[PDB]
Amino acid sequence: TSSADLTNLKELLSLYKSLRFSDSVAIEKYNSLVEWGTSTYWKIGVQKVTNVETSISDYYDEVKNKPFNIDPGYYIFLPVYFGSVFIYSKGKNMVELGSGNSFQIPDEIRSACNKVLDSDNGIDFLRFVLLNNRWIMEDAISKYQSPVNIFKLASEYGLNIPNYLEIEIEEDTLFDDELYSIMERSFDDTFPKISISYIKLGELKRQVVDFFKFSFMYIESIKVDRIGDNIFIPSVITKSGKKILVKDVDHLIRSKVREHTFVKVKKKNTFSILYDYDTRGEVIKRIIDTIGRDYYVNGKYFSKVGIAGLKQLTNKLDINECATVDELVDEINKSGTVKRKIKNQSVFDLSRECLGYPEADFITLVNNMRFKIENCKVVNFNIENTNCLNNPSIETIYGNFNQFVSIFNTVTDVKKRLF
Amino acid sequence: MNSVTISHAPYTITYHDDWEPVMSQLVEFYNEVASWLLRDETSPIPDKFFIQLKQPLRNKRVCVCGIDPYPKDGTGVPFESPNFTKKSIKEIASSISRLTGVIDYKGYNLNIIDGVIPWNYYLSCKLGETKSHAIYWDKISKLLLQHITKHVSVLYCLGKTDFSNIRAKLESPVTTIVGYHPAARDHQFEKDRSFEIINVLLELDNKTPINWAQGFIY
Amino acid sequence: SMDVRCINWFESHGENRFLYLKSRCRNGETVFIRFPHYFYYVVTDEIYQSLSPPPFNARPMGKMRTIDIDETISYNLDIKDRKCSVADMWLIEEPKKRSIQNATMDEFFNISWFYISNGISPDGCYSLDEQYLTKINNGCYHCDDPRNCFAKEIPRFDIPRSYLFLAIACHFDKKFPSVFINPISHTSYCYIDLSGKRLLFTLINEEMLTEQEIQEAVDRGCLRIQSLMEMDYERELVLCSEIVLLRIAKQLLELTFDYVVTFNGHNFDLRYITNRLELLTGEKIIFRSPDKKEAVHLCIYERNQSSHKGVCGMANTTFHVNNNNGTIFFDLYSFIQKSEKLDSYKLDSISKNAFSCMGKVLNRGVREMTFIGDDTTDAKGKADTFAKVLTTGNYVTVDEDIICKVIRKDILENGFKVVLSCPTLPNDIYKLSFGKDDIDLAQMYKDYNLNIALDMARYCIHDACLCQYLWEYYGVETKTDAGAATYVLPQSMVFEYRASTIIKGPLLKLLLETKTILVRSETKQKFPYEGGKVFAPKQKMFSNNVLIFDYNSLYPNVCIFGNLSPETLVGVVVSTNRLEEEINNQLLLQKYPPPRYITVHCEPRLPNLISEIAIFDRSIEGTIPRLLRTFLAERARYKKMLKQATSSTEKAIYDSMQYTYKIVANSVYGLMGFRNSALYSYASAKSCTSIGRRMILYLESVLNGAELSNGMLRFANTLSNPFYMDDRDINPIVKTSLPIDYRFRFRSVYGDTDSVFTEIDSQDVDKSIEIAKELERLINSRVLFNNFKIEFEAVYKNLIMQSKKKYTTMKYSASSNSKSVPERINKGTSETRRDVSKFHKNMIKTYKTRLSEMLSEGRMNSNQVCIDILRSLETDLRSEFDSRSSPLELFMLSRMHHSNYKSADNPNMYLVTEYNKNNPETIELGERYYFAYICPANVPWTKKLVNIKTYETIIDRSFKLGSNQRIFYEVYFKRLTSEIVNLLDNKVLCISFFQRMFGSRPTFY
DNA sequence: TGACGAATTAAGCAATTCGTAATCA
DNA sequence: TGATTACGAATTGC
């Protein structure tokens, strides 16, 4: 009845419009306001939706696989790489497609997204593409602005964007393999390109096209490749030595690939992509003893079980390398950010993120094991339930508990001093 | 349009087909209160008690409900002044003009807007004594309002104290708004924004908003 | 003025708002006092010195402490302190409502502020001083300084009171009456004035009689009046016209009685009178204020109460009068609905439940029987109440089924003698009650003469007097006075609200005494939490004495012991893994030492968390414990008063009062676990439940397998406090005062929340009672500690346990011996449920008794018991199906009507809605109704029952089974046989029988 | 001249039994 | 054409 009720109902309607492109927090707020509205008006036209399977097929159609005909209007071309597809909404989380989760993202990327959202309100959604920690604006759609200036200001913000292309067509022409090759040479990038999306000025719908063919290739072996710090990317080489790329380790352990076997693969002019959709513990243990016992799987990546050290603590804290415990305090008072982040964060969390174990496996390892402590320090650890011995990655975690307890004790008695 | 006959005045009720499954009961309820009711001069005139029964109900979306007709000069169709003198219609027209921006007009009639049916809970009232015929009309009122609610999507009730227990009077739930009466003193209806809320709710229920400026008379 | 005792407080809602006090003096004069009535707000000094228009008046309250009572979860032991501030506070009074931004203490009523800030009790005796009073009318004064006027309190003195009880009887043709077609036939009044005179009179409408009949009635002894001014109340029967009768009613209802009492009058009687008076004449019933400045018309209004469960929805309706003269219009129907729980709430059922006595047969022969009732037949006081009701009663029910008409009645010094018209009965003692009457009212109105008029007059005067009998039986006056004193509420509001309102007066007094305010900042979150612990019973039949031990006010005492209040909670420490859990436990045991702080372990709040500890402080007493202490003291007072009672009525009244205080004390804890409440504290409710579970487990561990030998008692475990180390002894070797030669063993079998059932290997009840008394003494002295105390309830014989909350037994009280009659006790079985049957109950009783007799005898050759029972049941069911001799009353079930349903389809609501659409009498929103299962007569025995809710029909008082309709015996038979089967032991034969008779698979335990 | 308020909202969980819809061979 | 489970409603015991 009052103004506040009008604002509440308006925001409820706005949230109802954008429901598939929403995270847990937005869903919870929408459910709460639905409950409030049902309570105050005794009836309302919307219900409480909980599952909400994320999908983006509304703005896309079926992928063309044959040459077709184009002619009218200016065309804007945006390429698509291989990698994980993400959705970012207006003032919302940074979610997976299909399996939307609060995926951890760099704080600089969070600040860039916040400032690009504060730049203007005319943004429906943003489509992210990821490949080996390389973050790209894949798609930026809007109902008011134009897909030209937004990528310019995002580039000036500090993150790079593909070269969106503008072309003019006046005569009836046929888009075919030759034109695909022309467009492929037209982006002029070494990154793996998959499809091309063409849009017209005025039309909100975006149509993408991709060309591919089938091939059969043998699988030789699995080898990790160096792509950063304590992170590995799997790679399989061919009998001919060709490089077959992959988006995720999930692709491998769902592909159920066997040692020395032949599989189908979508081959293109430059590179090829393995095809999925051909138990799980068998595949994970098989790949684990294939690549080598001294390895572990960190979510969608591969990682080492190395011995770490005080350098592995000093690197993240943005402080100079040193090997004396007293020194590891002075830089703490030199930078306000370092002391703030050491005070606010806990001891177990910081010592866990020192050595880069994941969350779930470490937690389920801890909650079935006995401890014996003395003055806030761990002196004895033993196992109680032997079931956790089934998963080999758990054995990889068990292999290096001593380094973790050492860094935990060091962190606790340095926190005892720096306060 | 079908006609049925009753023992007492007005001896004739003509109705739209959408009101068919209620009329029989209505008749059995009117033959026991007619003799007592028709002992007093009433506004509206007996011949105009049931003139809202000719409006179809299958194309309506909103109901704007009063509690009793004007004490004097009642036209039969609720919330109507043919010469624009009653305070309630004047102030509702002022509010709707403020909402939509129209400044120059000479009359407002809620009966012209598409999708809106205006209604009165009590169909009669003695000359100068409001709410004086509650006992005669009670059952008929419940029956007819329950029939209306089964078709519309939003029920807007004007009058805070009069409709304090509207949910007890209705069996099936429906979207309900209770607000201050226009003629209420202390200037409480001026700050009410019920019409925008109605449009928001309607468009939230996959329904067309109401062209609220359609009712102005030029 | 001078000495006055208060009767009522009430408001006026005219142009100016006032508050009124009605009182009586010693001689009998009635005095009215008028107070200006304000809106109360509480502000700080800073807000007080920044109010844009200065307030009307402000009074200083002193220095008060504000505490934030929100709860937050902490992941380590660095817990931040609670936000506490201290400031000078002001109490501002405003004639009209105001909006102040940061005002606190906003959950308390205005009348509570008046009472507490002025130091006045709603039910006290005072010696007013006339210096502060101004006379504004004859019998009405005005007070501007209530603090000085009510400064002197004096002891209580007794005063006279005035009452009007009334009933009406209306003509009808085929169903409920209608105010537009049907006139009032009879009106009956019982009148008590301030001089103690009791008058009974009945007015008869003469318009529905012939002139010769009127002349005959006048010659018989009645009085005929043509005008309102020639009516005398000293005549028993007066005949007149309808207008004169309505005018007499209007004259009576406008007087200043203390109480006008009716049964379902606010919805039928007064409504009918007002409407008919407005139809025939144009007059209205007018109420006036004590200052003669406001006038209102009688107009009954409706209050709807909704539920706090899911969907909320409406759940009750009540009707009220809008008078403004101080008279209390009381409806016994709503009161009894809210007070006790019965199958039906009609007047006949309440009369049968209330006025029943055991009677001895004195004579027989012909078609009449003579009964006598005396103090040596039933109990002390039952005969006197039966004799009181027999002064006007007409029909008596014998042996719960037979209805008889009274021929002669004599009142004795200690009982009654009655002669009834009933067939010959072969016994010596029967049970008589006042209940249903076998008269067809519609037929009587069809052919109407003088004799039926006089009989209806007698029935109506009995109906009027039943209101007074029920008013005295239930002790409404004592309950009103006690509630007004304890809840700090006006007398007319004591029976109108639930626990959330009746605890606010004492809470406000407590807060003002302690100088404390409680505030909330962030929103409240609701999580599930566990409750009491129920043990699984170890056997089914026992054949050994069982001793019942219970706690005394378990949850209130737990809250007092642990100091569980929202403002005494230091914090909640959680952990997500065992390493942090160990670190936190070691730190917590030394930061918060046991004697002053209490730590409670609980189940985790969220799936990820694996631990949760709550810490409470005990240095300063909390707010909830003080409320609980107040209510516990009230309950102790009324238990003590019950102990000294002799008559039955006083005993029942005092038992009800102590029960009410118990329920209020438990409601305080429940509110502390209620999300939409001001006293919400999730941690406190969880901790109270956890401590209760620990206490019952401790008692069960101490008692299970405990034995006494020589004069010595050995418990199973160590008497160690399960929370922390203390200074008590821990030795399980205890010296007893029992005889040396005794030797017994004790084993625990069952327990619900705060109770233990201890089995003893003995059969005699004197020895068992003595052992139980000694055990209770020893447990209270040595096992328990602080404010925890247990009681020995009873001795149970022949305990039969079906499930975790269903058992039957014979009970011997603690103050009983072997040569004393026991009590049959059923708990949760298919005899106390209001939704089973009356056929089901009788069959269950006869078959349980037969099975017990057969088990006592004992054959069990191979499967003799099962075959015998199944054959007997089949024969009985077939006979009932074929003969169809059992009436419909044995097949009626009962249910309440409401509108709190998920989904609006809901067959139950649809059934009631259709009944209301097709029938004159309407079922309301908190009303119990009867229903049954009916099917067409030609259908044969049905095996597969597919749709059952389609066959439910509502059975009103004028229902008659049609010649093409029959009771659907199949549903009742299936339920009864499912009950019987679970009692036996065979499974193959039972399954075969069930599949033959009903074509479905049974369900077992 | 043409309505507002009065008629400020409200205890918890554990266990059993019954009918009907929804999911599975 | 059955089996089995899941859910809502009613009523009772603490």
Ligand SMILES: Cc1cn([C@H]2C[C@H](O)[C@@H](COP(=O)(O)OP(=O)(O)OP(=O)(O)O)O2)c(=O)[nH]c1=O
């Ligand atoms: C009956 C009842 C119990 N309970 C809870 C509170 C009690 O601590 C617990 C056990 O109930 P009871 O043992 O039945 O109640 P009590 O302990 O107060 O008994 P007594 O009067 O002899 O002292 O169950 C309620 O919360 N509400 C209730 O209505």
Ligand SMILES: [Mg+2]
């Ligand atoms: Mg107890």
